């Protein structure tokens, strides 16, 4: 969340900027005035507590004196007990005010970066750049890597290759359930390992995260909507944890409570996160939108002064990865009304799906500045200064497989993307269709 | 579970053999007599239902006649309604008897194979065979692959290599939580991919299973104790699923309700299962006994006549895998009292851990005959004949890493097992210790 002082003009803050941001987000603007008002009540309580402390200390000294002189102190004792009973009430109120103030601040989104387009409608997303492989004329219903008619959807290609089983998957785990089979498995592993090797060659540290997280830690990195909507809860006898939606969650907390005190030397720290991911929300057929999938994630901590440059570097890394796979794409700047609480700015890389004949999101890249690091107490250098946290998908692997399937299909099977070959037993350049589909021409 | 007819001597069954097996298991012997008694009550109910059907049909014809002749039928109508009211009761009882009978049978373990040692005490496990690499003199406190003093435990080696993070892991997910880091990640992926390639070269079909399963399917393949003890439950709004303990669970159900009608040609079917695994029970330090880990599993369906030969083939496959990693081991035949419900026979491969100076289980191999396939209705050929199901660990990868760490350690770092090198970026032959431990000599 934002610093309490950001709301307080008298403490160098900028509440007007927070109001403008709230408005761009399409979120409550009144919340800002409410926070400021509650802050003043909290301050009044603190003053009142301090005055009671001093009066109490004072009447204590008098009682000591009274007893020393062997004089009755009933009057002072009465005053003491009254001041004491008032102090009790004030302590309770201060605690309540502090709690409610923190809950309110927690509802306010990060300050939307000035570059972001102000709109609630994704039709207004910024077209940042477009890339095509140089031998792919234009995005159309043609497989980019083969020049073949993009005749089959990703689900159909995968079925014909016998690379997954949605029917047995649904029987065993329900909605959108699936097994991967034979080359479906090898392709998924190839993307995971290629992804880890690609990032490690860029100095990222491979990090495989646990897929369960304690509630209290998760709550510090993820917004409310995410719990009562997005995350599966795990029951462990009497205890509960959450399954993660992305390794960004546990990895963001990896350095919680730590301090990069010599940041010129210690930062940036860059992690190639790997984990399975679980989402309660997944809506057609295929492994494009499912409840469980794997992701290689970039997660980076930087000095506050350097996060914007790193943002460009991280999307550049993802772009380079998709270029290496020969997949056409565009990069779009997401409108303000579509940012989650933590993001100050977000670019999506959306790759061309030639059967679908549309660009579909494969990557999101966000600068969350110090919104999470403040909660997680990840300090930077010598109120407090915190690191900036950025996250960017490298590959949601099953979804990336869908894009590969549509772009590498041809009449008799699938061409294997060159960079993935070394990661698959036999280093096949091509794998044939094994099965015909019921519906065909 | 066992066939109902196995309990019925009059139906070609062998209840004495089931009693003997129960006794070997240290489970209830009385359960067998109880099942037989309840079966007879069920039969009595069925007879009574059939007699009521015939009487009812009979009195119906008379009522028709009576009405045809325009005669009063109050007497017949009364008899009809009485027979009807009795039929209602019988139907309800039959359903209850059938339910209780099935619940009882479900409690009876698979018939323990005659080769299995009859005992409740693992000290009596059969020593089946022992293997050592030919340049490793004997199991002692010496790293088998390097000849170096096995000075460090697996946890210490992994710490010195900076290959995992138990401290940040525990903070984020609690008990035994961990991240894998750098080479810890690459080694885990290497074992997964080596394992898949090793089995696929043997004709196994790679199969990556979903890690969630619907309750009703899980209950058909896994015993009661497993739910109220072993499995995490997942909360999905109003619904619930389980996280799997091993890909053997969903893969055993992969062919549920299917029929291998030409088994000479269609069987055996062999799967190289891959998934993460989740266990509520994990007890020191390290990634040897943890709540979440990955496993490559052999899962095989065969004709009933061929399962014993396949059992030998499957343990042979696991042995060959450990031999290829240079890890000394022994194979032990688990005593009757230690078999789970489904296993008719189980071998554990236990690998030598030179720091621990003990053999520790890395592989279990079981022939479950048709105990699960009967529940899952997986038929074989032309009462009913079902396939046999066998399962054997190829590698619990994090645990296998522990064995590698102790056996490949030397004074200045870790030798990378030769077969894994091709799977790790840079194909390192050796990786140096990066960190010193607080406690040392």
Swiss-Prot record, chains A, B:
Organism of this sequence: Candida albicans (strain SC5314 / ATCC MYA-2876)
Q: Name one GO molecular function term.
A: ATP binding
Per the record, the similarity remark reads:
Belongs to the class-II aminoacyl-tRNA synthetase family. Type-1 seryl-tRNA synthetase subfamily.
What is the protein's given name?
Serine--tRNA ligase, cytoplasmic
- Please name one Pfam family that this protein belongs to: tRNA-synt_2b
List localization entries.
Cytoplasm, Cytosol
A single Gene Ontology biological process assigned to it is: seryl-tRNA aminoacylation
Cited SUPFAM superfamilies? Class II aaRS and biotin synthetases, tRNA-binding arm
